[PDB]
Amino acid sequence: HLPLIAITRNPVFPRFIKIIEVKNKKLVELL
Amino acid sequence: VVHEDFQVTEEVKALTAEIVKTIRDIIALNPLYRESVLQMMQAGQRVVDNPIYLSDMGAALT
């Protein structure tokens, strides 16, 4: 039960490492 | 300021990608300015709501 992650134009292909940076800090508090 | 654009804004962005890639190539081989500005604004960042201005900046480095 966690809020939906904000993709913000960051497609993540299967078995492919990706980096996400979102200006919103709320994701930082969740992390 | 005429900014006519096609209804299906799906495959046009592909061209834009090539542009920045070419731009990258330039700064990779014939550096002119700092690459930090390129890092700040990215195609995948979505903060670019004015593509014509991005094209103007790309032509500016010419």
mmCIF file with all atom_site columns, N, CA and C in Angstrom, chain B residues 23-57:
data_model
loop_
_atom_site.group_PDB
_atom_site.id
_atom_site.type_symbol
_atom_site.label_atom_id
_atom_site.label_alt_id
_atom_site.label_comp_id
_atom_site.label_asym_id
_atom_site.label_entity_id
_atom_site.label_seq_id
_atom_site.pdbx_PDB_ins_code
_atom_site.Cartn_x
_atom_site.Cartn_y
_atom_site.Cartn_z
_atom_site.occupancy
_atom_site.B_iso_or_equiv
_atom_site.pdbx_formal_charge
_atom_site.auth_seq_id
_atom_site.auth_comp_id
_atom_site.auth_asym_id
_atom_site.auth_atom_id
_atom_site.pdbx_PDB_model_num
ATOM 1   N N  . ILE B 1 23 ? 23.826 17.639 -31.708 1.00 0.00 ? 23 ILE B N  1
ATOM 2   C CA . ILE B 1 23 ? 24.374 18.660 -30.822 1.00 0.00 ? 23 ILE B CA 1
ATOM 3   C C  . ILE B 1 23 ? 25.370 18.027 -29.863 1.00 0.00 ? 23 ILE B C  1
ATOM 4   N N  . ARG B 1 24 ? 24.977 16.915 -29.237 1.00 0.00 ? 24 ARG B N  1
ATOM 5   C CA . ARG B 1 24 ? 25.902 16.204 -28.364 1.00 0.00 ? 24 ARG B CA 1
ATOM 6   C C  . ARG B 1 24 ? 27.200 15.914 -29.103 1.00 0.00 ? 24 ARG B C  1
ATOM 7   N N  . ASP B 1 25 ? 27.092 15.331 -30.301 1.00 0.00 ? 25 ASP B N  1
ATOM 8   C CA . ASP B 1 25 ? 28.285 15.022 -31.079 1.00 0.00 ? 25 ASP B CA 1
ATOM 9   C C  . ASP B 1 25 ? 29.176 16.247 -31.200 1.00 0.00 ? 25 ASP B C  1
ATOM 10  N N  . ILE B 1 26 ? 28.580 17.406 -31.488 1.00 0.00 ? 26 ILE B N  1
ATOM 11  C CA . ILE B 1 26 ? 29.365 18.632 -31.604 1.00 0.00 ? 26 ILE B CA 1
ATOM 12  C C  . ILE B 1 26 ? 30.182 18.840 -30.336 1.00 0.00 ? 26 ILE B C  1
ATOM 13  N N  . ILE B 1 27 ? 29.501 18.917 -29.190 1.00 0.00 ? 27 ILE B N  1
ATOM 14  C CA . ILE B 1 27 ? 30.213 19.179 -27.947 1.00 0.00 ? 27 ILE B CA 1
ATOM 15  C C  . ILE B 1 27 ? 31.128 18.019 -27.589 1.00 0.00 ? 27 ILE B C  1
ATOM 16  N N  . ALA B 1 28 ? 30.922 16.849 -28.197 1.00 0.00 ? 28 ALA B N  1
ATOM 17  C CA . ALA B 1 28 ? 31.827 15.732 -27.972 1.00 0.00 ? 28 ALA B CA 1
ATOM 18  C C  . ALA B 1 28 ? 33.129 15.891 -28.746 1.00 0.00 ? 28 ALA B C  1
ATOM 19  N N  . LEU B 1 29 ? 33.082 16.516 -29.921 1.00 0.00 ? 29 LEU B N  1
ATOM 20  C CA . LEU B 1 29 ? 34.238 16.609 -30.806 1.00 0.00 ? 29 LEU B CA 1
ATOM 21  C C  . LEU B 1 29 ? 34.792 18.018 -30.937 1.00 0.00 ? 29 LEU B C  1
ATOM 22  N N  . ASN B 1 30 ? 33.934 19.035 -30.933 1.00 0.00 ? 30 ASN B N  1
ATOM 23  C CA . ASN B 1 30 ? 34.345 20.431 -31.077 1.00 0.00 ? 30 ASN B CA 1
ATOM 24  C C  . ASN B 1 30 ? 33.680 21.248 -29.976 1.00 0.00 ? 30 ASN B C  1
ATOM 25  N N  . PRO B 1 31 ? 34.151 21.116 -28.736 1.00 0.00 ? 31 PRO B N  1
ATOM 26  C CA . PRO B 1 31 ? 33.483 21.802 -27.623 1.00 0.00 ? 31 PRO B CA 1
ATOM 27  C C  . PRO B 1 31 ? 33.449 23.310 -27.828 1.00 0.00 ? 31 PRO B C  1
ATOM 28  N N  . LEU B 1 32 ? 32.301 23.905 -27.510 1.00 0.00 ? 32 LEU B N  1
ATOM 29  C CA . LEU B 1 32 ? 32.107 25.348 -27.596 1.00 0.00 ? 32 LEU B CA 1
ATOM 30  C C  . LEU B 1 32 ? 31.753 25.963 -26.252 1.00 0.00 ? 32 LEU B C  1
ATOM 31  N N  . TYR B 1 33 ? 30.779 25.394 -25.546 1.00 0.00 ? 33 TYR B N  1
ATOM 32  C CA . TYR B 1 33 ? 30.353 25.869 -24.238 1.00 0.00 ? 33 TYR B CA 1
ATOM 33  C C  . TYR B 1 33 ? 30.377 24.701 -23.260 1.00 0.00 ? 33 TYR B C  1
ATOM 34  N N  . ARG B 1 34 ? 30.002 24.982 -22.016 1.00 0.00 ? 34 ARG B N  1
ATOM 35  C CA . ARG B 1 34 ? 29.892 23.932 -21.015 1.00 0.00 ? 34 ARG B CA 1
ATOM 36  C C  . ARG B 1 34 ? 28.719 23.013 -21.338 1.00 0.00 ? 34 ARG B C  1
ATOM 37  N N  . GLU B 1 35 ? 28.883 21.733 -21.013 1.00 0.00 ? 35 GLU B N  1
ATOM 38  C CA . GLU B 1 35 ? 27.831 20.750 -21.234 1.00 0.00 ? 35 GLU B CA 1
ATOM 39  C C  . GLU B 1 35 ? 26.797 20.732 -20.116 1.00 0.00 ? 35 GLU B C  1
ATOM 40  N N  . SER B 1 36 ? 26.978 21.545 -19.072 1.00 0.00 ? 36 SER B N  1
ATOM 41  C CA . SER B 1 36 ? 26.040 21.531 -17.954 1.00 0.00 ? 36 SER B CA 1
ATOM 42  C C  . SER B 1 36 ? 24.638 21.922 -18.403 1.00 0.00 ? 36 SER B C  1
ATOM 43  N N  . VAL B 1 37 ? 24.529 22.936 -19.264 1.00 0.00 ? 37 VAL B N  1
ATOM 44  C CA . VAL B 1 37 ? 23.215 23.378 -19.724 1.00 0.00 ? 37 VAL B CA 1
ATOM 45  C C  . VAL B 1 37 ? 22.492 22.238 -20.429 1.00 0.00 ? 37 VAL B C  1
ATOM 46  N N  . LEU B 1 38 ? 23.231 21.421 -21.181 1.00 0.00 ? 38 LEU B N  1
ATOM 47  C CA . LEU B 1 38 ? 22.628 20.241 -21.792 1.00 0.00 ? 38 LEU B CA 1
ATOM 48  C C  . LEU B 1 38 ? 22.094 19.292 -20.727 1.00 0.00 ? 38 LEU B C  1
ATOM 49  N N  . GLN B 1 39 ? 22.842 19.114 -19.636 1.00 0.00 ? 39 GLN B N  1
ATOM 50  C CA . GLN B 1 39 ? 22.394 18.224 -18.569 1.00 0.00 ? 39 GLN B CA 1
ATOM 51  C C  . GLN B 1 39 ? 21.121 18.743 -17.911 1.00 0.00 ? 39 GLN B C  1
ATOM 52  N N  . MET B 1 40 ? 21.046 20.054 -17.666 1.00 0.00 ? 40 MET B N  1
ATOM 53  C CA . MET B 1 40 ? 19.900 20.606 -16.947 1.00 0.00 ? 40 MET B CA 1
ATOM 54  C C  . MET B 1 40 ? 18.601 20.327 -17.693 1.00 0.00 ? 40 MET B C  1
ATOM 55  N N  . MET B 1 41 ? 18.557 20.663 -18.979 1.00 0.00 ? 41 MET B N  1
ATOM 56  C CA . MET B 1 41 ? 17.379 20.454 -19.812 1.00 0.00 ? 41 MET B CA 1
ATOM 57  C C  . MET B 1 41 ? 17.583 19.190 -20.638 1.00 0.00 ? 41 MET B C  1
ATOM 58  N N  . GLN B 1 42 ? 16.682 18.224 -20.477 1.00 0.00 ? 42 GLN B N  1
ATOM 59  C CA . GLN B 1 42 ? 16.773 16.945 -21.164 1.00 0.00 ? 42 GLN B CA 1
ATOM 60  C C  . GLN B 1 42 ? 15.441 16.624 -21.826 1.00 0.00 ? 42 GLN B C  1
ATOM 61  N N  . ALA B 1 43 ? 15.514 15.899 -22.945 1.00 0.00 ? 43 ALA B N  1
ATOM 62  C CA . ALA B 1 43 ? 14.298 15.525 -23.660 1.00 0.00 ? 43 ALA B CA 1
ATOM 63  C C  . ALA B 1 43 ? 13.392 14.667 -22.787 1.00 0.00 ? 43 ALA B C  1
ATOM 64  N N  . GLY B 1 44 ? 13.976 13.747 -22.019 1.00 0.00 ? 44 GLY B N  1
ATOM 65  C CA . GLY B 1 44 ? 13.201 12.924 -21.112 1.00 0.00 ? 44 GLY B CA 1
ATOM 66  C C  . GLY B 1 44 ? 12.775 13.610 -19.833 1.00 0.00 ? 44 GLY B C  1
ATOM 67  N N  . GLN B 1 45 ? 13.262 14.828 -19.584 1.00 0.00 ? 45 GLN B N  1
ATOM 68  C CA . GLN B 1 45 ? 12.883 15.551 -18.375 1.00 0.00 ? 45 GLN B CA 1
ATOM 69  C C  . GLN B 1 45 ? 11.465 16.102 -18.460 1.00 0.00 ? 45 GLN B C  1
ATOM 70  N N  . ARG B 1 46 ? 10.993 16.415 -19.666 1.00 0.00 ? 46 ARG B N  1
ATOM 71  C CA . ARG B 1 46 ? 9.650  16.907 -19.970 1.00 0.00 ? 46 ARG B CA 1
ATOM 72  C C  . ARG B 1 46 ? 9.486  18.386 -19.629 1.00 0.00 ? 46 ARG B C  1
ATOM 73  N N  . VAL B 1 47 ? 10.500 19.042 -19.060 1.00 0.00 ? 47 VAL B N  1
ATOM 74  C CA . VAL B 1 47 ? 10.389 20.461 -18.740 1.00 0.00 ? 47 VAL B CA 1
ATOM 75  C C  . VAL B 1 47 ? 10.404 21.347 -19.975 1.00 0.00 ? 47 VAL B C  1
ATOM 76  N N  . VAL B 1 48 ? 10.707 20.790 -21.146 1.00 0.00 ? 48 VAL B N  1
ATOM 77  C CA . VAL B 1 48 ? 10.793 21.562 -22.382 1.00 0.00 ? 48 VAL B CA 1
ATOM 78  C C  . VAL B 1 48 ? 9.399  21.586 -23.003 1.00 0.00 ? 48 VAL B C  1
ATOM 79  N N  . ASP B 1 49 ? 8.662  22.667 -22.757 1.00 0.00 ? 49 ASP B N  1
ATOM 80  C CA . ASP B 1 49 ? 7.344  22.869 -23.344 1.00 0.00 ? 49 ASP B CA 1
ATOM 81  C C  . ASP B 1 49 ? 7.376  23.779 -24.565 1.00 0.00 ? 49 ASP B C  1
ATOM 82  N N  . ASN B 1 50 ? 8.556  24.240 -24.977 1.00 0.00 ? 50 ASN B N  1
ATOM 83  C CA . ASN B 1 50 ? 8.710  25.155 -26.107 1.00 0.00 ? 50 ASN B CA 1
ATOM 84  C C  . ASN B 1 50 ? 9.772  24.586 -27.039 1.00 0.00 ? 50 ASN B C  1
ATOM 85  N N  . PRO B 1 51 ? 9.430  23.555 -27.817 1.00 0.00 ? 51 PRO B N  1
ATOM 86  C CA . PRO B 1 51 ? 10.448 22.918 -28.670 1.00 0.00 ? 51 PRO B CA 1
ATOM 87  C C  . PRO B 1 51 ? 11.083 23.863 -29.675 1.00 0.00 ? 51 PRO B C  1
ATOM 88  N N  . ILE B 1 52 ? 10.346 24.864 -30.160 1.00 0.00 ? 52 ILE B N  1
ATOM 89  C CA . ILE B 1 52 ? 10.926 25.798 -31.122 1.00 0.00 ? 52 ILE B CA 1
ATOM 90  C C  . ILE B 1 52 ? 12.090 26.551 -30.491 1.00 0.00 ? 52 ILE B C  1
ATOM 91  N N  . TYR B 1 53 ? 11.978 26.890 -29.205 1.00 0.00 ? 53 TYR B N  1
ATOM 92  C CA . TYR B 1 53 ? 13.093 27.540 -28.522 1.00 0.00 ? 53 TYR B CA 1
ATOM 93  C C  . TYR B 1 53 ? 14.280 26.593 -28.379 1.00 0.00 ? 53 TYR B C  1
ATOM 94  N N  . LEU B 1 54 ? 14.020 25.303 -28.156 1.00 0.00 ? 54 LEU B N  1
ATOM 95  C CA . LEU B 1 54 ? 15.112 24.335 -28.132 1.00 0.00 ? 54 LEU B CA 1
ATOM 96  C C  . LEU B 1 54 ? 15.817 24.280 -29.481 1.00 0.00 ? 54 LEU B C  1
ATOM 97  N N  . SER B 1 55 ? 15.049 24.294 -30.572 1.00 0.00 ? 55 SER B N  1
ATOM 98  C CA . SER B 1 55 ? 15.655 24.318 -31.899 1.00 0.00 ? 55 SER B CA 1
ATOM 99  C C  . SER B 1 55 ? 16.453 25.598 -32.115 1.00 0.00 ? 55 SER B C  1
ATOM 100 N N  . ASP B 1 56 ? 15.933 26.728 -31.630 1.00 0.00 ? 56 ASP B N  1
ATOM 101 C CA . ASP B 1 56 ? 16.664 27.986 -31.741 1.00 0.00 ? 56 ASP B CA 1
ATOM 102 C C  . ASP B 1 56 ? 17.994 27.911 -31.004 1.00 0.00 ? 56 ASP B C  1
ATOM 103 N N  . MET B 1 57 ? 17.989 27.357 -29.790 1.00 0.00 ? 57 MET B N  1
ATOM 104 C CA . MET B 1 57 ? 19.235 27.199 -29.046 1.00 0.00 ? 57 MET B CA 1
ATOM 105 C C  . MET B 1 57 ? 20.190 26.257 -29.768 1.00 0.00 ? 57 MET B C  1
#
